[PDB]
Design a protein around this motif. Structure first.
Motif, PDB file in Angstrom:
ATOM      1  N   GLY A  36      37.872   5.395 -56.831  1.00 44.13           N
ATOM      2  CA  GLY A  36      38.199   6.287 -55.494  1.00 44.13           C
ATOM      3  C   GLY A  36      39.202   5.338 -54.834  1.00 44.13           C
ATOM      4  N   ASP A  37      38.816   4.198 -54.307  1.00 42.07           N
ATOM      5  CA  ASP A  37      39.475   3.523 -53.623  1.00 42.07           C
ATOM      6  C   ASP A  37      40.987   3.140 -53.743  1.00 42.07           C
ATOM      7  N   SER A  38      41.614   4.014 -53.423  1.00 39.67           N
ATOM      8  CA  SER A  38      43.230   3.991 -53.753  1.00 39.67           C
ATOM      9  C   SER A  38      43.929   3.280 -52.903  1.00 39.67           C
ATOM     10  N   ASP A  39      43.636   3.300 -51.720  1.00 42.87           N
ATOM     11  CA  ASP A  39      44.224   2.386 -50.627  1.00 42.87           C
ATOM     12  C   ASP A  39      44.025   1.098 -50.620  1.00 42.87           C
ATOM     13  N   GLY A  40      42.953   0.757 -51.482  1.00 41.84           N
ATOM     14  CA  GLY A  40      42.662  -0.769 -51.860  1.00 41.84           C
ATOM     15  C   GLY A  40      42.294  -1.429 -50.659  1.00 41.84           C
ATOM     16  N   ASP A  41      41.399  -0.812 -49.918  1.00 40.93           N
ATOM     17  CA  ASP A  41      40.725  -1.488 -48.431  1.00 40.93           C
ATOM     18  C   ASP A  41      39.243  -1.964 -48.713  1.00 40.93           C
ATOM     19  N   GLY A  42      38.845  -2.269 -50.139  1.00 42.26           N
ATOM     20  CA  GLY A  42      37.633  -2.593 -50.495  1.00 42.26           C
ATOM     21  C   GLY A  42      36.378  -1.710 -50.003  1.00 42.26           C
ATOM     22  N   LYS A  43      36.705  -0.628 -49.975  1.00 42.93           N
ATOM     23  CA  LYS A  43      35.549   0.433 -49.355  1.00 42.93           C
ATOM     24  C   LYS A  43      35.751   1.822 -50.015  1.00 42.93           C
ATOM     25  N   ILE A  44      34.855   2.612 -49.884  1.00 33.35           N
ATOM     26  CA  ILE A  44      34.809   3.789 -50.368  1.00 33.35           C
ATOM     27  C   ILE A  44      35.116   4.697 -49.415  1.00 33.35           C
ATOM     28  N   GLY A  45      36.493   5.265 -48.987  1.00 29.01           N
ATOM     29  CA  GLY A  45      36.618   6.335 -48.311  1.00 29.01           C
ATOM     30  C   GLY A  45      35.883   7.370 -49.016  1.00 29.01           C
ATOM     31  N   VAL A  46      35.367   8.407 -48.080  1.00 27.71           N
ATOM     32  CA  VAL A  46      34.522   9.391 -48.534  1.00 27.71           C
ATOM     33  C   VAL A  46      35.221  10.515 -49.153  1.00 27.71           C
ATOM     34  N   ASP A  47      36.569  10.606 -48.912  1.00 29.10           N
ATOM     35  CA  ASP A  47      37.504  11.319 -49.619  1.00 29.10           C
ATOM     36  C   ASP A  47      37.925  10.499 -50.626  1.00 29.10           C
ATOM     37  N   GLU A  48      37.945   9.374 -50.828  1.00 29.31           N
ATOM     38  CA  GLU A  48      38.485   8.719 -52.011  1.00 29.31           C
ATOM     39  C   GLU A  48      37.238   8.757 -53.029  1.00 29.31           C
ATOM     40  N   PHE A  49      36.112   8.945 -52.245  1.00 25.77           N
ATOM     41  CA  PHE A  49      34.773   9.181 -53.026  1.00 25.77           C
ATOM     42  C   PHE A  49      34.758  10.474 -53.955  1.00 25.77           C
TER      43      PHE A  49
HETATM   44 CA    CA Z   1      39.921   2.730 -49.636  1.00 24.96          CA
END
Ligand code: CA
Ligand code: CA
Length: 109
Positions: free
Chosen positions: A90-103
């Motif tokens: 999901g993490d498409s922006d590559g910020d080492g997180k799960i954006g819930v929209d990425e989720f």
């Molecule tokens: Ca991300």
């Protein structure tokens, strides 16, 4: 164990037992196996609070580590390549997180 039938503890445990070996990180199979790809917005929002195991309005890598214990009590903590490929699902922006929209995107595929 003591969760809602929204999730199947056995299916959670199954894929988590499999995604314990480096190279065997089919976490997308996890979503479709546990039935997470068949969740409604409301369900996915409580699942939001799962990747946000800290409840910090943001979901970082350190949260994805124990987020599974928040998902199910007998879940495995994700390893190097596991958390990596799983996050990036999901993490498409590559910020080492799960954006819930990425989720929502990674779960839906
Ligand atoms: Ca991300
Ligand atoms: Ca958090």
């Amino acid at each position: 164990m003591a969760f809602a039938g929204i999730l199947n503890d056995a299916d959670i445990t199954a894929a988590l037992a499999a995604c314990k070996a480096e190279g065997s990180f089919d976490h997308k199979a996890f979503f479709t196996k546990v039935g997470l790809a068949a969740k409604s917005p409301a369900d996915i929002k409580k699942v939001f609070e799962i990747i946000d195991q800290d409840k910090s309005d943001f979901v970082e890598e350190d949260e994805l580590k124990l987020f599974l214990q928040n998902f199910s009590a007998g879940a495995r903590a994700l390893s190097d390549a596991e958390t990596k490929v799983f996050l990036k699902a999901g993490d498409s922006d590559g910020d080492g997180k799960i954006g819930v929209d990425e989720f929502g995107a990674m779960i839906k595929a």
